[PDB]
């Protein structure tokens, strides 16, 4: 069983609630499954090429029957890095996302990463009725840290980071998805110590059954 620990939190001075819950999960999981391989993909220190003019130019050449050698050096580096992210994602059995909420969504790279892992012929295929996912036997956890409370109630409609990630996962075939919110620390800093520990305990219990 291969697990991808995919994180999108910059290594700043302040610390990270999401990272603390994520590391607690991964350590608890590794204790339960000493034989499973865990791979850390840090999105702030991984090449995650955005779909741009070069990527469209590479795609236009593939459509025109030309190969990889017809691409420029920059184009070659871009699609090789895209394919390596894609292959890694396809090869894993389990995905664990760790994300902060910025501006009611996730950091930009998370979108860049999803645009890398959602590829025709690889994670979805076209049908008469539109694209359908190809992935089977997958399972995913999303750990999101938020300043306010969005897990339940009215504000759930504006938790765009969570809701989009679940949709893309669902699109490619991964609809067995767990969710752990580390929420309300900026709303109630007085109980941020207890919110973190409650989420850590919730993570350690899930690792025993993930």
Ligand X SMILES: Nc1c(S(=O)(=O)O)cc(Nc2ccc(Nc3nc(Cl)nc(Nc4ccccc4S(=O)(=O)O)n3)c(S(=O)(=O)O)c2)c2c1C(=O)c1ccccc1C2=O
Ligand Y SMILES: Cc1cc2nc3c(=O)[nH]c(=O)nc-3n(C[C@H](O)[C@H](O)[C@H](O)COP(=O)(O)O)c2cc1C
Residue list, annotated binding site for Ca(2+) = 202
Residue 68: which of a second copy, ligand Y, ligand X, none does it interact with, CB under 5 to 8 A by kind?
none
Residue 164: which of ligand X, a second copy, ligand Y, none does it interact with, CB under 5 to 8 A by kind?
a second copy
Q: Is 46 left (phi over 0), alpha (psi -120 to 50) or beta?
A: beta
Q: Which of 206, 114, 100 is nearest to 159 (CA)?
A: 100
C-alpha to C-alpha distance for 195 and 135, rounded to whole angstroms: 34
CB-based contact 93:138 (threshold 8 Å):
yes
Of these, 104, 176, 201, 208, which contacts ligand Y (CB under 6 A)?
Answer: 104
Per CB under 6 A, 130 contacts ligand X: yes
Q: CB 51 → a second copy: shortest distance, Å?
A: 7
C-alpha to C-alpha distance for 83 and 81, rounded to whole angstroms: 6
Considering only residues 10 through 69, tell me which ones interact with ligand Y, judged by CB under 6 A.
11, 16-19, 51
User: What is the CA 51 to chain-centroid distance, rounded?
Assistant: 17
Q: CB 68 → ligand Y: shortest distance, Å?
A: 19
- Give me the residues that bind a second copy (CB under 8 A), please: 10-14, 44, 50-53, 55-57, 60, 102-109, 111-112, 114-115, 118, 130, 147-148, 158, 160, 163-164, 167-168, 171, 186-187
Q: CB 184 → ligand X: shortest distance, Å?
A: 5
Looking up tokens 């979805």 gives: 124
Considering only residues 172 through 191, tell me which ones interact with ligand X, judged by CB under 6 A.
184, 186-187
User: What is the CA 87 to chain-centroid distance, rounded?
Assistant: 14
Alpha-helical regions (H) of 36-72: 53-63
Q: CB 180 → ligand X: shortest distance, Å?
A: 17
């Amino acid at each position: 069983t291969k697990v991808l620990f995919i994180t999108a939190n910059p290594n700043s001075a302040e610390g990270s609630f999401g990272m603390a819950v994520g590391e607690a999960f991964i350590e608890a999981y590794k204790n339960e499954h000493p034989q499973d391989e865990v791979v850390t993909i840090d999105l702030f220190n991984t090449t995650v090429p955005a779909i741009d003019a070069d990527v469209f130019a590479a795609w236009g050449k593939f459509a025109a029957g030309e190969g990889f050698e017809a691409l420029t050096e920059v184009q070659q580096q871009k699609v090789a890095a895209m394919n390596t992210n894609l292959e890694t994602f396809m090869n894993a059995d389990r995905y664990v996302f760790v994300t902060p909420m910025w501006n009611f969504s996730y950091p930009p790279v998370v979108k860049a990463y999803l645009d890398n892992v959602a590829i025709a012929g690889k994670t979805f295929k076209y049908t008469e009725n539109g694209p359908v996912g190809l992935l089977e036997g997958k399972k995913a956890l999303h750990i999101q840290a938020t300043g306010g409370v969005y897990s339940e109630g009215a504000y759930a409609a504006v938790d765009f980071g969570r809701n989009h990630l679940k949709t893309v996962l669902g699109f490619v075939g991964v609809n067995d998805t767990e969710y752990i919110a580390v929420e309300g620390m900026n709303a109630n800093p007085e109980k941020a110590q207890e919110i973190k520990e409650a989420a850590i305990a919730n993570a350690r219990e899930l690792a025993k059954r993930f």
